[PDB]
C-alpha cells in the first residue's frame, strides 16, 4: 500500500509539473513580447529626450 501511495503522489506531481511546464511556455512567449515592447520603449524614450532637447534649443 505504501508503494501504491508513493506511485499516486508521483503521478500527481508529474501532473502539476506538466501544467507548470505549459504555463512556463506561456511565460516565455510573454517575455519575448515584453522584450519587444521594452526595446520599442527605449527607442521612443531616446527619441523623446532628443526631441525635447531640440525644442529646448529652439525656444532658447
Amino acid at each position: 500500500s505504501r508503494t501504491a501511495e508513493l506511485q499516486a503522489e508521483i503521478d500527481d506531481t508529474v501532473g502539476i509539473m506538466r501544467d507548470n511546464i505549459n504555463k512556463v511556455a506561456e511565460r516565455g512567449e510573454r517575455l519575448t513580447s515584453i522584450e519587444d515592447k521594452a526595446d520599442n520603449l527605449a527607442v521612443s524614450a531616446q527619441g523623446f529626450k532628443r526631441g525635447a532637447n531640440r525644442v529646448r534649443k529652439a525656444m532658447w
Binding site: 516565455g28 522584450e35 521594452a38 529626450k49 529646448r56
Partner: protein, 45 residues
C-alpha cells in the same frame, strides 16, 4: 519534466535581463526629456 522546466527558466533569464535594462534606459531618457521640456517652457514663457 522538471529538467525542461529549469531549461525554459534559464532561457527566460535572458529576457528578464534585457527587459529590466530597456525599461530603465527608457525611464532614464524620459526623465531627461521632461527636464528639457521644463527648460523649454521656462524659456518660452
Amino acid at each position: 519534466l522538471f529538467n525542461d522546466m529549469e531549461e525554459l527558466v534559464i532561457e527566460q533569464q535572458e529576457n528578464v535581463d534585457v527587459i529590466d535594462k530597456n525599461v530603465e534606459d527608457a525611464q532614464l531618457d524620459v526623465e531627461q526629456g521632461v527636464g528639457h521640456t521644463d527648460k523649454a517652457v521656462k524659456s518660452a514663457r
